[PDB]
Design an enzyme around this catalytic site. Structure first.
Site, PDB file in Angstrom:
ATOM      1  N   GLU A   1       0.826  -1.204   0.000  1.00  0.00           N
ATOM      2  CA  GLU A   1       0.000   0.000   0.000  1.00  0.00           C
ATOM      3  C   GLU A   1       0.864   1.260   0.000  1.00  0.00           C
ATOM      4  O   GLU A   1       0.569   2.207  -0.727  1.00  0.00           O
ATOM      5  CB  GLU A   1      -0.941   0.041   1.210  1.00  0.00           C
ATOM      6  CG  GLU A   1      -1.911   1.225   1.141  1.00  0.00           C
ATOM      7  CD  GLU A   1      -2.642   1.487   2.437  1.00  0.00           C
ATOM      8  OE1 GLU A   1      -1.967   1.604   3.476  1.00  0.00           O
ATOM      9  OE2 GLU A   1      -3.889   1.590   2.417  1.00  0.00           O
TER      10      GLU A   1
ATOM     11  N   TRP B   1      -8.313  -2.425  -0.471  1.00  0.00           N
ATOM     12  CA  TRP B   1      -9.064  -1.293  -1.018  1.00  0.00           C
ATOM     13  C   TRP B   1     -10.217  -1.728  -1.913  1.00  0.00           C
ATOM     14  O   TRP B   1     -10.927  -0.891  -2.469  1.00  0.00           O
ATOM     15  CB  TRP B   1      -8.148  -0.354  -1.816  1.00  0.00           C
ATOM     16  CG  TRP B   1      -7.366   0.571  -0.954  1.00  0.00           C
ATOM     17  CD1 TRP B   1      -6.128   0.354  -0.422  1.00  0.00           C
ATOM     18  CD2 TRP B   1      -7.801   1.843  -0.458  1.00  0.00           C
ATOM     19  NE1 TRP B   1      -5.765   1.414   0.380  1.00  0.00           N
ATOM     20  CE2 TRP B   1      -6.775   2.341   0.373  1.00  0.00           C
ATOM     21  CE3 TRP B   1      -8.962   2.610  -0.638  1.00  0.00           C
ATOM     22  CZ2 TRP B   1      -6.872   3.577   1.030  1.00  0.00           C
ATOM     23  CZ3 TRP B   1      -9.060   3.839   0.014  1.00  0.00           C
ATOM     24  CH2 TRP B   1      -8.019   4.309   0.838  1.00  0.00           C
TER      25      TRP B   1
ATOM     26  N   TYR C   1      -5.465   9.540  -0.995  1.00  0.00           N
ATOM     27  CA  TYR C   1      -4.065   9.664  -0.568  1.00  0.00           C
ATOM     28  C   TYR C   1      -2.991   9.895  -1.627  1.00  0.00           C
ATOM     29  O   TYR C   1      -2.451  10.997  -1.736  1.00  0.00           O
ATOM     30  CB  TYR C   1      -3.664   8.443   0.264  1.00  0.00           C
ATOM     31  CG  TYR C   1      -4.518   8.225   1.488  1.00  0.00           C
ATOM     32  CD1 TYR C   1      -4.418   9.068   2.596  1.00  0.00           C
ATOM     33  CD2 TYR C   1      -5.431   7.170   1.538  1.00  0.00           C
ATOM     34  CE1 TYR C   1      -5.209   8.860   3.725  1.00  0.00           C
ATOM     35  CE2 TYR C   1      -6.220   6.953   2.656  1.00  0.00           C
ATOM     36  CZ  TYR C   1      -6.104   7.798   3.747  1.00  0.00           C
ATOM     37  OH  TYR C   1      -6.870   7.552   4.864  1.00  0.00           O
TER      38      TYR C   1
ATOM     39  N   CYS D   1      -8.058   9.489   6.345  1.00  0.00           N
ATOM     40  CA  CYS D   1      -8.041   9.249   7.786  1.00  0.00           C
ATOM     41  C   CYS D   1      -6.715   9.759   8.342  1.00  0.00           C
ATOM     42  O   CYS D   1      -6.697  10.498   9.331  1.00  0.00           O
ATOM     43  CB  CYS D   1      -8.228   7.761   8.079  1.00  0.00           C
ATOM     44  SG  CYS D   1      -9.894   7.188   7.681  1.00  0.00           S
TER      45      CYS D   1
ATOM     46  N   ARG E   1      -7.372  11.825  11.933  1.00  0.00           N
ATOM     47  CA  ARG E   1      -8.668  12.357  12.365  1.00  0.00           C
ATOM     48  C   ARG E   1      -9.605  11.342  12.995  1.00  0.00           C
ATOM     49  O   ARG E   1     -10.421  11.696  13.835  1.00  0.00           O
ATOM     50  CB  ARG E   1      -9.412  13.005  11.198  1.00  0.00           C
ATOM     51  CG  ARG E   1      -9.917  11.987  10.186  1.00  0.00           C
ATOM     52  CD  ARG E   1     -10.820  12.616   9.150  1.00  0.00           C
ATOM     53  NE  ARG E   1     -11.194  11.641   8.136  1.00  0.00           N
ATOM     54  CZ  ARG E   1     -12.226  10.812   8.232  1.00  0.00           C
ATOM     55  NH1 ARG E   1     -13.017  10.851   9.296  1.00  0.00           N
ATOM     56  NH2 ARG E   1     -12.473   9.954   7.249  1.00  0.00           N
TER      57      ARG E   1
ATOM     58  N   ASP F   1      -9.790   3.499  14.481  1.00  0.00           N
ATOM     59  CA  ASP F   1     -10.320   2.283  15.103  1.00  0.00           C
ATOM     60  C   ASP F   1      -9.055   1.744  15.778  1.00  0.00           C
ATOM     61  O   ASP F   1      -8.169   1.221  15.103  1.00  0.00           O
ATOM     62  CB  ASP F   1     -10.788   1.299  14.025  1.00  0.00           C
ATOM     63  CG  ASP F   1     -11.240  -0.031  14.597  1.00  0.00           C
ATOM     64  OD1 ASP F   1     -10.634  -0.492  15.586  1.00  0.00           O
ATOM     65  OD2 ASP F   1     -12.193  -0.626  14.043  1.00  0.00           O
TER      66      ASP F   1
HETATM   67  O1  LIG Z   1      -6.016   4.157   8.469  1.00  0.00           O
HETATM   68  C1  LIG Z   1      -7.161   4.015   8.899  1.00  0.00           C
HETATM   69  C2  LIG Z   1      -8.350   3.962   8.053  1.00  0.00           C
HETATM   70  C3  LIG Z   1      -9.623   3.812   8.617  1.00  0.00           C
HETATM   71  N1  LIG Z   1      -9.735   3.721   9.942  1.00  0.00           N
HETATM   72  C4  LIG Z   1     -11.090   3.623  10.535  1.00  0.00           C
HETATM   73  C5  LIG Z   1     -11.481   4.882  11.307  1.00  0.00           C
HETATM   74  C6  LIG Z   1     -12.940   4.582  11.586  1.00  0.00           C
HETATM   75  O2  LIG Z   1     -12.913   3.445  12.444  1.00  0.00           O
HETATM   76  C7  LIG Z   1     -13.538   4.115  10.256  1.00  0.00           C
HETATM   77  C8  LIG Z   1     -13.815   5.309   9.340  1.00  0.00           C
HETATM   78  O3  LIG Z   1     -14.900   6.113   9.896  1.00  0.00           O
HETATM   79  P1  LIG Z   1     -15.030   7.684   9.571  1.00  0.00           P
HETATM   80  O4  LIG Z   1     -13.954   8.402  10.283  1.00  0.00           O
HETATM   81  O5  LIG Z   1     -14.912   7.928   8.114  1.00  0.00           O
HETATM   82  O6  LIG Z   1     -16.344   8.170  10.047  1.00  0.00           O
HETATM   83  O7  LIG Z   1     -12.354   3.336   9.743  1.00  0.00           O
HETATM   84  C9  LIG Z   1      -8.657   3.753  10.837  1.00  0.00           C
HETATM   85  O8  LIG Z   1      -8.806   3.649  12.054  1.00  0.00           O
HETATM   86  N2  LIG Z   1      -7.396   3.901  10.267  1.00  0.00           N
END
Ligand SMILES: O=c1ccn([C@H]2C[C@H](O)[C@@H](COP(=O)(O)O)O2)c(=O)[nH]1
Ligand SMILES: O=C1OC(c2ccc(O)c(Br)c2)(c2ccc(O)c(Br)c2)c2cccc3c(Cl)ccc1c23
Ligand SMILES: O=C1OC(c2ccc(O)c(Br)c2)(c2ccc(O)c(Br)c2)c2cccc3c(Cl)ccc1c23
Ligand SMILES: O=c1ccn([C@H]2C[C@H](O)[C@@H](COP(=O)(O)O)O2)c(=O)[nH]1
Ligand SMILES: Oc1ccccc1Br
Lengths: 264, 264
Positions: B58, B80, B94, B146, B166, B169
């Protein structure tokens, strides 16, 4: 305040020595974060006298989106004078990006209204963000954004905000920066019928200039005092209708001001 | 890792019950920061087995700037797939912003090359930044960035980097995200003849999904083990010439993998 003094001490104890754009040397650290529970009081430094007049006018100016310093001049606010051209223009700095970020297809995006729309209709959104870091317009700006990007968050009826500051003069700019954003949070919270949460400050290159060392040691020898209380005497019809007189600081009893000169 | 487990425990103890994108509830906190001294070893979680194959592919894909998943598919990388359209396109996510941020006047800005130029000619710059948060192109992206922006810093011959995420998870994405950027720092440092410094992770909405609670308690019951060491078998002529086989992880002895399902 405690968080602020702790950061000053950290820069002194752990900072590395290195200059700035062909100029004054500094002690710097990279990556720091402080949290201010706005319910504990308005975060206006008390270990040295700080004035909010210019801070308030600048914020109202940012919110209007016009980057000419005319409004600042009409109110005798001179903090942007050294960067403005003969016409009083600064290029597409903060305000322009906040209210009219230009897209490749010719549109202008109002990020402030967008954020308010999100806080009203989708408060749990993980993307309530405002960015001033418009890569395609940096070269036209009198200066690259320092407080580059911020994000809002809502939980338990409280509005929080995190700011990413890419570069920070801990002695001169930080107190100003913290007060500015704390004010914005209070304003946004009032417009959304929310209580104030935390203001989280995150820094990139955080530094102290070599010629502010005595001033720093002096401020560090002072004990922080209870924080003042911010009072908004009126609830405007929108985030764009606030006026200078709407704000009042209650119970502010700081130590005397400390002058910190800069090289040219 | 110690820092990672501490954050996980923090979300559990201080997190607020918050719902997400019309779906699974979460426990979340706002604003947190972790620091990884890359000199202490490569930050690949050891309290559960993590595979770097997809992470490496990636990153190489991001650096090439093409947002079609063809390259990922050629190497059977499917992370993806759920966001790509019938043609394998993701919109200007990105990679596109990193390598070809569109300006209002028709230009495309290569931020990666820009940063490398800065690290070579002006390492003390306080604006060595890469942002994927292109407000004007969010609506065209399959998903909003993200890991939204990052900044580099150089001190004592060491390269550091701070990422602003921002939304995160903590259980599923964070380990992946940390490894990805740690790899980038190593590559950038190798290209600039610098030692690796710290990777600073800063988060916005940091959460744990309600259906990952058992998994979280299990991982928290495990002791982190010594971190592995990243080995780059070759020094490419540029940041864009790295190959999958150039990377090797030495001394990785993690606890067994933990599966964490997601709702649809
Ligand atoms: O690099 C990454 C990409 C995605 N997510 C997660 C964040 C949230 O759990 C969900 C996306 O939700 P939103 O922020 O778009 O609402 O996937 C991560 O934690 N890290
Ligand atoms: O350009 C500034 O100037 C002042 C300043 C004050 C004393 C001094 O010795 C020096 Br040097 C600079 C400033 C602040 C508030 C004001 O009302 C006025 Br007037 C001037 C200032 C203080 C703290 C933070 C500042 C920031 Cl973040 C930006 C611009 C100014 C700035
Ligand atoms: O889309 C993904 O999928 C996986 C995933 C794994 C198990 C599982 O139960 C679920 Br749900 C998802 C993932 C990770 C590595 C891989 O090689 C493959 Br294949 C898939 C994954 C794990 C950790 C972080 C991930 C991030 Cl940050 C983005 C995308 C994926 C992702
Ligand atoms: O809100 C602000 C505006 C400016 N500065 C400081 C940061 C640096 O001390 C100097 C700008 O230098 P560069 O980061 O642009 O290199 O002014 C702050 O600290 N806060
Ligand atoms: O002059 C001042 C004193 C205290 C708070 C704000 C201002 Br402006």
């Amino acid at each position: 305040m405690k968080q602020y003094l702790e950061l000053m001490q950290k820069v002194l104890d752990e900072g590395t020595q290195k200059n700035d754009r062909t100029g004054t040397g500094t002690l710097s650290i990279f990556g720091h974060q402080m949290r201010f529970n706005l319910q504990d009081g308005f975060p206006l430094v008390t270990t040295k006298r700080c004035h909010l007049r210019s801070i308030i006018h600048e914020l109202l100016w940012f919110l209007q989106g016009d980057t000419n310093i005319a409004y600042l001049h009409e109110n005798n606010v001179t903090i942007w004078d050294e960067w403005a051209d003969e016409n009083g223009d600064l290029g597409p700095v903060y305000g322009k990006q906040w209210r009219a970020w230009p897209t490749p297809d010719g549109r202008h995006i109002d990020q402030i209204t967008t954020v308010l729309n999100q806080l009203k209709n989708d408060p749990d959104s993980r993307r309530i963000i405002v960015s001033a870091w418009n890569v395609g317009e940096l070269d036209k700006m009198a200066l690259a954004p320092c407080h580059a990007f911020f994000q809002f968050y809502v939980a338990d009826g409280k509005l929080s905000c995190q700011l990413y500051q890419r570069s920070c003069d801990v002695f001169l700019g930080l107190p100003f920066n913290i007060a500015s954003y704390a004010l914005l949070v209070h304003m946004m919270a009032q417009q959304c019928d929310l209580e104030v949460g935390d203001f989280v400050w995150t820094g990139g290159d955080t530094h102290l200039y070599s010629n502010h060392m005595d001033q720093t040691h002096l401020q560090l020898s002072r004990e922080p005092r209870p924080l003042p209380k911010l009072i908004i005497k009126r609830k405007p019809e929108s985030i764009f209708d606030y006026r200078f007189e709407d704000f009042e600081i209650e119970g502010y009893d700081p130590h005397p001001g400390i002058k910190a000169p800069v090289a040219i």
